[PDB]
């Protein structure tokens, strides 16, 4: 079919919790074979790897290439270009990319369980809503006490774009279902959001049975001495 | 490319708030032989209508057939079988579609805005969560007071599948941002969910300020 070239950004999880900054250049529309040649603008330690072909939709071949060890330029603000040349071509294809600009730090809100869920006393839902960040990629994890729960315990949605009241932004939500006894005993749950805009790439919001609303608190202030030669 | 026949159930939106119902049987991966005869065994009521082939997979002329007016048979429990033939082989292709049982209603929760939002005197966020419904189709809308809102004002996510062990169920969420002045004035807001399993196919939840448990403090200053 129609040949095309594209570039895939490094996965967010690998960048945040990894050390291999692999950037992949993908080529489609192979005709009968794969005799393509790939190259990049930089070559200092560019251990480019092609690999065996694969199967495309409708029946077709597509061989991609990878470039690891580029984390430092990626964070410093470099631009990466991949150019490919296939035998049945007269002009090599090209693709270019760079780190996204105009990034907005997410706003994280942990909403306590709905008041109706705490009366049936079977399970309760904690909602973590991250709102208002420019790039799409984001991560959501959970902690009970200090130990993270397995990722097969909760449900996270894809990052989507929200209505515009100004500039463009995105949003994501996650939910955890936990035993009511754990909540009413006094355990604390934390939601961790991982985004490139945040200062240390991660932030957390904690919640327990008492936080999030006063609901008849009892506060005591003593103010022991007030005329005592304050020097 | 590669022959393939698929059946699509009627869309929930039309089934709920509409009148006509679409019933789609589509063939893909031919790239030729536009004279494909889409024959439905339950040829009752209306008549099948063909459609011009469309470029699919950049190498196929996908051809689909619609059987409108079958909303009542679809709701009654009549199974629909689509039969078609292709010149590549002498074996006709037949596919079946029917309604599934074990339907569970959704649980809808509307959550007030976080306490850290009211300090900025900007919009405030209200979240609606529908959870636990077996069929993977649902539609969520919003109201401010009595006047509905356009679809270009709130965001909703796709109905994903939740990590349970007992039975398969799905969840969906949406958020609406409203003016702080409207929230503080006393105007109420609501989120409505529509799903097959509900007896009336529509429910909603309502939120307004100064609702719920009191939140006043009791301080004791001693001064020794």
């Amino acid at each position: 079919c129609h040949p095309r070239l594209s570039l895939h950004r490094p996965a967010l999880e690998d960048l945040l919790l990894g050390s291999e900054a692999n950037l992949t250049c993908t080529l489609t529309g192979l005709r009968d074979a794969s005799g393509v040649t790939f190259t990049w603008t930089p070559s200092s330690g560019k251990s480019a790897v092609q690999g065996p072909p694969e199967r495309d939709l409708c029946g077709c071949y597509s061989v991609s290439s990878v470039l690891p060890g580029c984390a430092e330029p990626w964070n410093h603000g470099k631009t990466f270009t991949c150019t490919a040349a296939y035998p049945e071509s007269k002009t090599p294809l090209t693709a270019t990319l760079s780190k996204s600009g105009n990034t907005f730090r997410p706003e994280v809100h942990l909403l306590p369980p709905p008041s109706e869920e705490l009366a049936l006393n079977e399970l309760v839902t904690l909602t973590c809503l991250a709102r208002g960040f420019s790039p799409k990629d984001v991560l959501v994890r959970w902690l009970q006490g200090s130990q993270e729960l397995p990722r097969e315990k909760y449900l996270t949605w894809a990052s989507r774009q929200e209505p515009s009241q100004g500039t463009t932004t995105f949003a994501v939500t996650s939910i955890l279902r936990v035993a009511a006894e754990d909540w009413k005993k006094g355990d604390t749950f934390s939601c961790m959001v991982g985004h490139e805009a945040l200062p240390l790439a991660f932030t957390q919001k904690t919640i327990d049975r008492l936080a999030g609303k006063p609901t008849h608190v009892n506060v005591s202030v003593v103010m022991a001495e007030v005329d005592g030669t304050c020097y | 490319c590669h022959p393939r026949l698929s059946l699509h159930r009627p869309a929930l939106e039309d089934l709920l708030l509409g009148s006509e119902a679409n019933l789609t049987c589509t063939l893909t991966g031919l790239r030729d032989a536009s004279g494909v005869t889409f024959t439905w065994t339950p040829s009752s009521g209306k008549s099948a209508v063909q459609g011009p082939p469309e470029r699919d997979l950049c190498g196929c002329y996908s051809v689909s057939s619609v059987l409108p007016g079958c909303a009542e048979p679809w709701n009654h429990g009549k199974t629909f079988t689509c039969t078609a033939a292709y010149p590549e082989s002498k074996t006709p292709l037949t596919a079946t579609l029917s309604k599934s049982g074990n339907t569970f209603r959704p649980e809808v929760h509307l959550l007030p805005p976080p306490s850290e939002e009211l300090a900025l005197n900007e919009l405030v966020t209200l979240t609606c969560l529908a959870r636990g419904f077996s069929p993977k189709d649902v539609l969520v809308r919003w109201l401010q007071g009595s006047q509905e809102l356009p679809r270009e004002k709130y965001l909703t996510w796709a109905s994903r599948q939740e990590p349970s062990q007992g039975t398969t169920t799905f969840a969906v969420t949406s958020i609406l941002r409203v003016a702080a002045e409207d929230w503080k004035k006393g105007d109420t807001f609501s989120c409505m969910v529509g799903h097959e399993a509900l007896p009336l196919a529509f429910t909603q939840k309502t939120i307004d300020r100064l609702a719920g448990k009191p939140t006043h403090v009791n301080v004791s200053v001693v001064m020794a």
Binding site: S115, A119 | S146, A211, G212, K213
Partner: peptide
């Protein structure tokens, strides 16, 4: 006279009753 106003009134009454029962359940614990 419209139905919607009466339905809204009934909804508000039921919501307030639900809140009161919510308070009563919690106060028992």
């Amino acid at each position: 006279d419209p139905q919607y106003r009466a339905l809204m009134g009934e909804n508000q009454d039921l919501r307030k009753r639900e809140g009161q029962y919510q308070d009563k359940i919690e106060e028992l614990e």
